[PDB]
Amino acid sequence: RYLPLSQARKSGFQMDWLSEPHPVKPTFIGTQVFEDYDLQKLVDYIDWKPFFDVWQLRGKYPNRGFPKIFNDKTVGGEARKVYDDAHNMLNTLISQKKLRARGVVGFWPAQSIQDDIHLYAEAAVPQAAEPIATFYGLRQQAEKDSASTEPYYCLSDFIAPLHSGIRDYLGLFAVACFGVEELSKAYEDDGDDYSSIMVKALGDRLAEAFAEELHERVRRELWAYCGSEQLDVADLRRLRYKGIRPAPGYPSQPDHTEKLTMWRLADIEQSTGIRLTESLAMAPASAVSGLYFSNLKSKYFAVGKISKDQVEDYALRKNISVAEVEKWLGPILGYDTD
């Protein structure tokens, strides 16, 4: 069962904006580019759990995960060998300056109207000016448990609405780890499958670590809405921090076409060289992007299956045909398509 959109909107995540702490204006409006980001600093943020699954190294309970994996006698020797070789190659890559990190971050004012999150210019009054970009959110529509107290979340519920007079802000980021594509070819031309796999796994790990480090810097020094936070990485990986960085295509907003707005607005192509292919996937493959939400009560959620009324409302909002929304939102349609 799916609730009607007109009723699912009423039971949304309502917040009292006039008593909640008013949002902090970031340190700049526009974008700032990181050209040759220090890769050595990112090594302390690398999440090694997904790295072991590239080689399908899985340990049994209770050693089922990094760094307990070194103890399990089934894989522990091989896990240690792979990890030590990864550290050796990582040191060689950073020392030789083969890989070159690159990224971009930016902030703009944001005001939510219904399920949209309209961004505005720096000096433009939100209530008396046109927006410069829009991020059309999707609201949860699936009916919840009878005893559930959860609201029907949408990404626009985390931005103060236009009528309340309170000014909110939104930021977005894009990071990449260039140079992996050439090194994989180099290690495959000379007959080295171990190095070819390892360099791509390390590139993915470095991209994720760059994303984590940039978010931690944003929360504390660029946006400064958590200036009193001094959390360690073992807490950052546990989502103990506040605020979220959802990415297009993920269960918060499964619409992959949203990346076009980000690339158009932040000028990611000219700033960093991270491209979007005809499938709307970042190139190189070791790239991460997303939007920064600074609300205290913001949390990750899954939109889930949606009904046809929301699909047509979304098509009307985005000014595209239904036959295209059904394409780009294919996996989440809750109704028969043909």
Side-chain angles (χ1 to χ4, degrees):
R1 273 194 80 270
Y2 315 102
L3 273 167
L5 180 66
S6 58
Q7 176 175 341
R9 286 187 175 147
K10 292 178 61 69
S11 307
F13 176 45
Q14 282 303 139
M15 261 165 68
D16 167 294
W17 297 101
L18 294 159
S19 73
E20 288 281 343
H22 301 306
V24 175
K25 181 179 177 183
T27 43
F28 60 94
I29 308 304
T31 51
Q32 187 172 103
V33 297
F34 308 116
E35 298 265 282
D36 166 77
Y37 211 77
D38 182 23
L39 300 111
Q40 184 59 44
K41 185 159 53 142
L42 308 176
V43 186
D44 296 297
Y45 293 103
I46 288 177
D47 179 20
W48 291 100
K49 156 56 72 182
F51 164 89
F52 284 97
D53 288 299
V54 174
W55 321 88
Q56 213 83 0
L57 300 168
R58 314 171 101 260
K60 296 304 196 296
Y61 175 100
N63 292 291
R64 49 189 292 168
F66 176 84
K68 325 290 284 282
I69 192 169
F70 297 162
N71 297 328
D72 194 341
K73 64 276 198 177
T74 60
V75 157
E78 319 312 318
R80 213 71 171 81
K81 161 167 82 63
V82 169
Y83 177 80
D84 284 350
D85 296 350
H87 263 287
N88 288 340
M89 181 185 327
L90 191 48
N91 288 0
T92 52
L93 291 180
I94 304 160
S95 58
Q96 269 161 278
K97 265 172 282 303
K98 297 305 279 292
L99 271 73
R100 134 171 184 97
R102 219 166 193 199
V104 67
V105 69
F107 306 106
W108 291 276
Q111 296 298 183
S112 61
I113 299 164
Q114 312 264 20
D115 295 321
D116 314 340
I117 299 153
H118 293 282
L119 312 192
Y120 301 83
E122 178 171 32
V125 183
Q127 258 285 349
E130 314 145 359
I132 78 183
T134 309
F135 291 88
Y136 305 95
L138 289 163
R139 184 161 293 269
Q140 288 195 324
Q141 206 175 9
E143 153 148 289
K144 309 192 173 208
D145 185 335
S146 70
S148 86
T149 59
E150 294 276 57
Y152 297 91
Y153 291 104
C154 172
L155 280 186
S156 85
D157 290 359
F158 310 141
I159 299 282
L162 185 62
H163 69 266
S164 70
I166 294 153
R167 301 223 204 292
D168 221 296
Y169 309 83
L170 187 85
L172 64 94
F173 80 106
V175 294
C177 203
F178 295 89
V180 180
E181 56 258 59
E182 302 165 33
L183 292 182
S184 100
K185 194 180 184 180
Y187 290 141
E188 290 267 40
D189 289 344
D190 299 351
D192 195 350
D193 283 288
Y194 185 77
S195 301
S196 317
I197 299 166
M198 181 149 296
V199 68
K200 284 176 125 85
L202 280 172
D204 171 33
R205 288 303 94 204
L206 285 170
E208 294 264 328
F210 190 10
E212 191 46 60
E213 197 270 352
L214 184 52
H215 193 197
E216 176 211 299
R217 281 195 65 202
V218 157
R219 292 206 306 285
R220 296 175 60 261
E221 319 169 27
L222 298 171
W223 205 334
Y225 69 91
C226 285
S228 57
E229 191 207 60
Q230 294 179 37
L231 287 182
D232 320 329
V233 186
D235 285 347
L236 295 192
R237 296 172 191 139
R238 214 173 186 165
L239 303 182
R240 194 179 166 209
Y241 66 105
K242 102 161 161 91
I244 56 167
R245 51 162 200 261
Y250 280 97
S252 305
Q253 176 64 310
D255 196 342
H256 261 277
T257 36
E258 293 309 324
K259 300 180 200 170
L260 289 161
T261 305
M262 313 181 17
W263 258 248
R264 191 220 86 214
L265 177 56
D267 197 348
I268 302 186
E269 191 66 350
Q270 185 94 10
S271 270
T272 66
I274 316 161
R275 316 195 325 288
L276 277 168
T277 63
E278 56 257 37
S279 186
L280 299 187
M282 301 139 289
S286 303
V288 195
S289 65
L291 307 156
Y292 290 140
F293 282 80
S294 64
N295 198 47
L296 191 83
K297 311 190 66 65
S298 62
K299 55 162 79 63
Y300 290 109
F301 72 99
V303 170
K305 304 293 190 169
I306 70 176
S307 197
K308 189 161 189 173
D309 52 51
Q310 177 147 200
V311 155
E312 314 200 29
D313 193 43
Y314 188 83
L316 184 82
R317 276 191 275 137
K318 213 189 231 302
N319 203 16
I320 56 178
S321 84
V322 184
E324 196 153 41
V325 176
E326 305 200 270
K327 184 193 301 322
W328 286 114
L329 297 183
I332 70 155
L333 302 182
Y335 62 100
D336 297 352
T337 56
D338 305 4

